[PDB]
Symmetry: D2
Subunit: 124 residues, 4 copies
């Protein structure tokens, strides 16, 4: 992976959540997520994918991952996906948008999905 070492590690977003990830040579993302907000406590499993051979023209590295909000402590009957790009450098960043879908009845499905944006950095 061209950015395998740049992506692997601990990241933090603007909410104070902690994203712990390992980037595999094959494009895999594996790790844990701890949300500072919402119906969440402690760590949750995450899995995702990244472009392991990104362009060399200065572009970011596309990636995404999922958390289902069930662990041994809580189950919020919901899943978030983050879709974004890694941008390397002295101030490396992962800039994302996300979709949080909750399980709902059919009558409430129109209101099942929140959208937002998180920026992750190696400090904070």
């Amino acid at each position: 992976g061209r950015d395998e070492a740049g992506i692997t590690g601990t990241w933090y977003n603007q909410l104070g959540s902690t994203f712990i990830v390992t980037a595999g040579a094959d494009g895999a993302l594996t790790g844990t997520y701890e949300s500072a907000v919402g119906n969440a406590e402690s760590r949750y499993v995450l899995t995702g994918r990244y472009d392991s051979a990104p362009a060399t023209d200065g572009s970011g590295t596309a990636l995404g991952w999922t958390v289902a909000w069930k662990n041994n402590y809580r189950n919020a009957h919901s899943a978030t996906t983050w879709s974004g790009q890694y941008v390397g450098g002295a101030q490396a960043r992962i800039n994302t948008q996300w979709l949080l879908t909750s399980g709902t009845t059919e009558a409430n499905a129109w209101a099942s999905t929140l959208v937002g944006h998180d920026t992750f950095t190696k400090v904070k």
Copy 2:
């Protein structure tokens, strides 16, 4: 997994894309995705998560998954995440919204992400 057997299998969306998934007892989703549209050919690896203990009140089962659009044939320097819910029954469905992020330069990052919605069924 309460819906492990309902989710595992081959699904098709309204574009004619093919989503092949296995739901594990631990909440994992693993499989392949073949898109009928865009800069894509043949199968791509996917990974994701689902709620393996959903509510029993008639609500759907939250889930999500990621594809990075690199395989042995092509690399579109992009990743899609689908966030949604599985709804079981004689006409089972997976209803999703998705975010497709491309690696971009910083100057083009404002236009990095497409959004849309796919519905998957067991027929088509």
Copy 3:
């Protein structure tokens, strides 16, 4: 407006909501919206814009509009924007995605915005 007459009128979405709109020659959209779901009763003012000189290559006509969910009956302290395209023909459609933002405290702002998709037709 090339599609002024095609857009003006009463439309209905998959939820049973009623979208009453007038397209002006200058690109304006004006009318009322009645939602069949959520914290809403009776009609709300809407305003928006459309491309009054669309491409002639078979493409749809881009448009968007806003409703703030305050009227003489209720105030849900929220606003929805629909962004989409009009597609003319015997089965005319307006295909949209939407963002529903609620006023929140700063601590809850991460969960302020719902996303979804509505399809409007001239029948239903």
Copy 4:
């Protein structure tokens, strides 16, 4: 309008775009938008709505607006809607998410809509 005076004026986002708006007592937003990026030059008409009687519990004020990207100079056959909330104070802000839909053929409609997020301030 409770925030009529707070909203009316000139705002700037993180891209350097200029949002000039008047908030009416009736909930209307009217003004012009100038984008620093994309297929845009000079000012475009905008219209939208805001909650003219927001909650008094510290919550933001919900609002939204639309620009169709046609003016006397250019027509990009597209429309953006911004959905967000105004947050008053010494560092007032309008925090938004947006959907940019382009007119497309049916075959390309899956890729018609970009999503992003802009923050507007009274300085910059």
